[PDB]
Subunit: 156 residues, 8 copies
């Protein structure tokens, strides 16, 4: 059923990660959302990453802040595309989050998006675009959505 | 023929972008490589982004340094996934490149990877992972590639 | 009619960009203000840049935050002077805005000003100074304006 | 004679500032180049700024690194457009230069360009664009220049 | 009469600069406080720096934020020690203020202190320490002040 | 036999990590050194962390650069003290390394040391200090070592 | 009695440092808490560091902000492991704190933790992990604590 | 005899600190130069700071890099003005040095100068200016020196 997995390290990250989920709902893309902590539930994170392909997921969106290792460790355990959303940390305003996620070494990519809510929104859209590369209907919806916002901004 | 488009603003960026192209070659994914400058050939960039889908491309890999606008402006003109590789700039060592690419606003995602050559490498792998979500053979090749490196590092 | 064009990616940027427009009003420089988004209305942005000179514009003031590409992409499409105002972003406080605007490569300059409201004010003054290089009346107005502030600051110099 | 003044705090900055001057030469815009130090020749800097308009200058390009105060202090003393080129400093790689120049307060704008040589090139182009807002011949030259580079980049687009 | 001159570019900087003035009051060092703007009253700033020595001043404390040029331009026009207090700017939290002040080139030193109120406090103490190098009574007062705080913190 | 485990993601990190090992040799503390990559050998990393205590290790020193997750992921899988050495990365000079290691969330500490070789040296010393809290002979050796350097710097 | 010493430069730091103390209470590890200022009570700091081992302390947790020298100066005066908590400063949000603590030179390590409260929590846990290397009961408690959180996050 | 003390943590800092000493030689101001390490010779540093006034020093110039605590700890032990020169560190290019020195808390000022050699030059000049506040001959020399450089730059 689910094509996209949206995961995060803590329930306090839900404030940020729900934007991604809104986009998936808006585009009618089935997904699952779960708390998976790289540091508090490491084994559970490995099991989630390992089984993702077998369970039918095509893309994983992972949100994390501070020493954000969730996206990269999930990426090291699955060859599904993994999208990393840097959550805005308290002290360093997501600078720590961003560098921990985007600077992955050769071999283990993480598709990194902007810090915060704009990034979460974009993670959902990027997941959609990934599916849209083979699901013509999802691609056509992204074009129509983008054409409506364009008309709205230009004429508003 | 070509599934992935690898573009960059200058021939000097090739030193960085070739790593992505080596990965595509290694995984037998057909691709095209071109110089497309957001600032020196803006119209051409739009024409390249507009037609990408019609031409058969499924993913675009774009590299740029400094005020790196190439990935983002291409992403605004196509709903294909766009992967942005921040090139290491002279003065700010790709920090400017990184922020200009990854901080895209809600509506226009760019899958951002590490600054420099590690990122270029990962851009090629990420493009493969995207294709691998629907091309099992490409996915199987990524798994085998990762398993060989694993064995190599652990036994080495 | 309009000599300056003041543009921005979103209505939320108006809070910042109105400072530039207050300056143009204060100096009686005709201008137009529009929402032009590099990412949400890319084609419209190109059309706005391309036609600027034909429409009579002499300078463009463009405000944007985050991955701020509006000033740079407008500058790549017109040879009118383009002034970029980095809008204070939420997470990185305009640092992302600043670098995305000022670090333009050889061939496509963008006259970059301070982050936020101070930069917006100065964008309006910089546009006026540009016009003032050939309009003596505008230049004289800038001198007078600056002389009044100087007197105002110096005669209110005692902290009491 | 001279329409643009290109100044810098030290001879060592010439390595960076000559890029602006190559552009002015290429476009046949008369200019003058001088060493004017905000910290080592402060009085001379004020004299140079004060008199710029009387001497016929229309734009000033000022390069400085570190605690780069030359562009800002020149801008506080003339209402001609002042373009600031952040010179790449040794320790902070121009980050100090950049912030010292771009973050000018309301009232005293400085048109800030990229750190280093790319910024220097663009300072020359920006000065030309400023003049080009009223000199159609200079504007036409900028359009032609930009059209030739475009063709040059696009026809050498195949990586081989 | 006045031994120290405390100046700043705007009345809004007073919130920060008063701490330095409280210290001078506390140590009975005569001082003057004025608004002197490097960018809005440049000529006046030069005149204030030029005449400082003739007028009897021994130290200048200058506060400024953003592109903070006041301390540095004053320092270039007088050979009195000049203490620069970086005011906390809105966007960059005084980072711009700090670099613009402290990075002065060889030939024109500015004694730079902490960003904000702690620095303002220290500017007053530093000015006293300078005077205390030749005024034993001022030095003795600094020692007693520091000894009282020490006792207060350790026993508190 | 081995009380300390010194690990790193790549052989290229050896240049930095040998400083820690030199200290352990100097102090005659038995240790093991291995390449363990969080991203290239994730499973092996888990196995290494899990079994550390059973194998007799008391402290783990882990070095990594860029998106440095090795120390943190090892720390999430063992309750032995884990010391993180940020390796100096090419583009961001270890700033990415530092933030990815030090900013661990509540529950999973990583004792972080300086970027580069100085940090590596200190990692070995810190591991010794930890052992020295219960091994009086190791503590006495650290004091004597520190006293000799003190005499050397002051008299040199 | 006390095995751990928790110190800080000012009572205002207490808000951050109590997190470490809560952990030590939770784990029933006896400790002492004191205000010890590197800059306001330097002599006292030296005395506290010097005598730590004689007084029976095994680990010292030190919190400081801004130009945070407390952890490092304490570390230069004792060969007990010293854990540095960077307190979130007002202007630079602990970046100054972090760099002033973590960047210790070869010879004088400071085990550095995250900026703020998360770091304080981890400082207490790290101190326990150090004691746990030789106190099996403390180690078992850390494992049980970590297992309960794991079950709580995964099932919650 | 000596009016100024020039100290540093390591002989490798001499490359930077000699510029300050050149200025003092050029201006004929007697001074002493010594290696004093805040971390390797902490007690010796306290003794040097404590006795500075009694020995006749009027100003102390202290150079240090990384976690640069030498200037601040010396400042906490003497009420003589203390000038801090941030040495350019390897990884963070003196950013660490700068923040560790300039962000001193209220009560313990450090007169901070630019990172590197320009700062060292300026430390010597600032010390001179401090003495020049009461030694008319030293002040007159600073004016003449500055007038010669002005003529040289303007006419050169």
């Amino acid at each position: 059923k689910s094509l996209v997995g949206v995961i995060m390290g803590s329930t306090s990250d839900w404030e940020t990660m729900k934007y991604a989920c809104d986009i998936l709902d808006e585009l009618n893309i089935p997904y699952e959302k779960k708390v998976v902590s790289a540091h508090r539930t490491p084994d559970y994170m490995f099991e989630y990453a390992e089984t993702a392909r077998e369970r039918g997921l095509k893309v994983i969106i992972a949100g994390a802040g501070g020493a954000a290792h969730l996206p990269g460790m999930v990426a090291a355990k699955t060859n599904l595309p993994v999208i990393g959303v840097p959550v805005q940390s308290k002290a360093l305003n997501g600078l720590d989050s961003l560098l921990s996620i985007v600077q992955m070494p050769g071999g283990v990519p993480v598709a990194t998006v902007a810090i915060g809510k704009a990034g979460s929104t974009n993670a959902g859209l990027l997941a959609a675009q990934i599916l849209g590369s083979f699901h013509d209907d999802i691609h056509d919806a992204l074009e129509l959505r983008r054409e409506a916002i364009e008309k709205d901004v230009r004429e508003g």
